[PDB]
């Protein structure tokens, strides 16, 4: 009569053209690339993860610099001392500083000296 219907496969395919239902056929043929795509994406993910880690560990530096600068702007002059003290101590001891390039530390030194 009129009440009989196809399988799961054909209905899924119709749903797949149907913009309401999308599968992921974009990487069905990448069997020998999906693994190492995920590998290099997770490697760049750990790289970017530790990179952002270093970057907010140095946002600490930017923060303390904006802090000391504001303190100048408010003429604290005492927590200014403690704060440049802390900043120097960190620059010396903050491993993040110890892993930065030579020129960045150069500029940091120059700014903190100024």
């Amino acid at each position: 009569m009129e009440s009989l219907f196809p399988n799961k496969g054909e209905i899924i395919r119709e749903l797949l053209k149907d913009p309401l239902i999308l599968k992921n056929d974009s990487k069905r043929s990448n069997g020998s690339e999906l693994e190492l795509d995920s590998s290099d994406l997770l490697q760049r993910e750990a790289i970017l993860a530790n990179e952002l880690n270093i970057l907010d560990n140095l946002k600490t530096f930017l923060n303390l610099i904006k802090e000391v600068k504001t303190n100048l702007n408010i003429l604290e002059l005492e927590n200014c001392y403690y704060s440049l003290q802390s900043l120097r101590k960190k620059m010396r001891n903050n491993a993040a500083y110890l892993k930065q390039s030579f020129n960045f530390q150069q500029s940091i030194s120059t700014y903190v000296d100024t």
């Binding site: 009129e2 219907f5 149907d18 599968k23 069905r28 999906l34 140095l58 610099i65």
Partner: protein, 151 residues
Amino acid sequence: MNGIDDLLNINDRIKQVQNERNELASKLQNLKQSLASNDTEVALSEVIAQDIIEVGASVEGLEQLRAKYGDLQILNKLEKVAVQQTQMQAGVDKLDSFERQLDELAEQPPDQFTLDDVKALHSKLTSVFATVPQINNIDSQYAAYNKLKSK
């Protein structure tokens, strides 16, 4: 990180690498979805297909499909065959009423009819024939309708 002005934008660079990590987490999620699609057998199941299979087996179930789950082409063919059945049924009823009118006028003396009377009746019946489109479906319920119509 090359200079002091890179630290002044190390918060901006934090946002840059946050966007990079977000793009890369999106790439990894997209890649996990792609690893999924590589199996024919995954979390994205026959859910809309399941509603079409379970509930769609009815005309009312199909109305529920297209209203709630969504309309697809089998819905369209089912409304087509349903309007075919309703057209053939309204034709059954209309040629039945018309047959009753014929049976009424049957002993109205044929002098009491007009070329315009028979013309009007013929236009009526031609129209009623026209209310029934031709559908090339193997006779399941169109057969009884055809018998009554030919009769």
